[PDB]
Amino acid sequence: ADTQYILPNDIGVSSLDCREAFRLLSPTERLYAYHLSRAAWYGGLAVLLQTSPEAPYIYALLSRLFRAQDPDQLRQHALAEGLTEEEYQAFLVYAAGVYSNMGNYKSFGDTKFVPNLPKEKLERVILGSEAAQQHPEEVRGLWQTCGELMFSLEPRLRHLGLGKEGITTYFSGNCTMEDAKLAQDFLDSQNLSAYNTRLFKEVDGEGKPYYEVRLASVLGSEPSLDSEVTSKLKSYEFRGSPFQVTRGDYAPILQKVVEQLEKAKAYAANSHQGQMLAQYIESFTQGSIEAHKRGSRFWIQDKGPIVESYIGFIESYRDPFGSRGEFEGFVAVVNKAMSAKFERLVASAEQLLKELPWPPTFEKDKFLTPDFTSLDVLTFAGSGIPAGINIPNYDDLRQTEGFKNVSLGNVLAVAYREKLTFLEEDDKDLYILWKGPSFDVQVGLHALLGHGSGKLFVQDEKGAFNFDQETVINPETGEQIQSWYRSGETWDSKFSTIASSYEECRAESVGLYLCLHPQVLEIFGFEGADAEDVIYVNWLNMVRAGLLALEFYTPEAFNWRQAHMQARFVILRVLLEAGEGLVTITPTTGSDGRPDARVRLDRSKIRSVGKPALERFLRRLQVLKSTGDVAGGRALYEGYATVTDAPPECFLTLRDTVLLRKESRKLIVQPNTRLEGSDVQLLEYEASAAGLIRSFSERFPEDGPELEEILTQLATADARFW
């Protein structure tokens, strides 16, 4: 666990490749990508504030440091100061790792990381630097501030979480889960969306806590403009404890953002963008979520756009509670050639939903061709760059009108035999061959029928429903539905901690399930000597992932650090339970002599045993999701998600091997867009920590020290919570 918290100097780095796709765009489309890229870039910094207390200061310090001297320039100083190269290089790694993750905690696994190097040396490198001979006040006023927490390994700072265990800036420092829950119910009572809000608890002389629910908006509480949020800014009372709904969270940043978006408007290919954008403006201005909802609908009402875009507080993964969303944004061009091979899958999508283990009344009421694309990414702001996504994240819309499916094409081209660990010399062959092609399948299904399926049972205001009660029955029980989602209630608001992992698990499982279908393979051009292989490598990869997931599980807190990995582990356990020698984990020994493991998946037993385990599973998951049954959902999940040393596996003992063979993910550098006035051009870098540093130091040529200054301030304001 020494290296759990550091980034190896040899970490792989790749540059997102988009040129052609950016070229084909005529100037109008171009700028219409441009300003969105810049807005996204502007807003993505708030992730520093949403990640760690010391993050913003770090970003400022780094940006300045490299602004004064680039990697090659600062190198000479670093080395001259007595640093061996292998040290400085590790520093560069740490900076790039803070840039890509928009913080000092990994977007994947939510674990802290520090520069690998003696502190006393970096003190030198930073102080003796050119940047410190120019503004010697700042460098010391920062280095003294964020210096330690940069390298701090103290147990409680290692992972993310509420209470004494971890660190989260979504909440104040004194908040426990109890608070997230209380304030949660309080949010659903007034039906406030938890996405854009943060909870800050405070205490007076007597031990009575008061709660500040803050919203992210450009305009803090002041004489209002007469919007929704207007009437919503006031004091409330909840169960012997006070509540206050306020706004103005990360204001100036969103100033910049709304700017760039409005600059985006006039270039819109149709009314849809030009308006939905404005809606986003409203949302990031008033702090009104509904405003984002509207533009979220418009965004699907728009189809087949040359340039695809989106932004907001969206994915809820990194909230210890699981409600509040992490800000992001993206602008990417739609590739045509690879999209048709998806649109196909959309055309025949209708049928498949009815192949799911639950009756048509347990599934969404109509259907759609919401969209499925292949996007070459230009700008993706925030902590990470997903392979594919299904949004907007509002379920209600998913059933009523629709959603969208997004397969990013050029991220793939980036991520692709001794590192094949926990496989066999066969296998890995098939793995190398079919991993890439199958990837598209698993993603298409995950996105389309993963979250595309399912239906929520909600109680509308009046005692009526969104469905017909007397005709609906639970196949597991046989009774008539006794549970549902009532007004203001939502997936995250109920399942919370599990909601993300649970849902993801469902999606992936449907992935395998339908991956077993001849049709889908015919869509991806797989059959005969082909249709085997791909399927196999897919399932095999799923079980293997189930094994690797151990790394992201914290036994001491009995807590999982990720939704996807945890879900994968769960699926693995289900398969294991199916038994019949279909799956095996063997405590082998690697050629190096150290410990090791080999995952053994009998392929012949796939349909005879595994499938049943699956559709039973899916059946249960769905069933509990429709009625929104948390008791059964958890009991069924946290049981499956439990990690112990019981044989004939001993996951507690395996986890160590998983950590020894552990991998550290690579970094994806991103290109910029420079404004020439009447023209715009693209700025690309090398694939390396250095290149990425160069990408970030050039990211904000105009306001860079201004933005740095902001982050510094916005941090200093809330410094009293941690």
């Binding site: 994947f108 990470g384 996504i389 991220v411 991520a415 993603v443 995950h446 996807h564």
Partner: peptide, 5 residues
């Protein structure tokens, strides 16, 4: 909602 690489 995200499916990672």
């Amino acid at each position: 909602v995200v499916y990672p690489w």
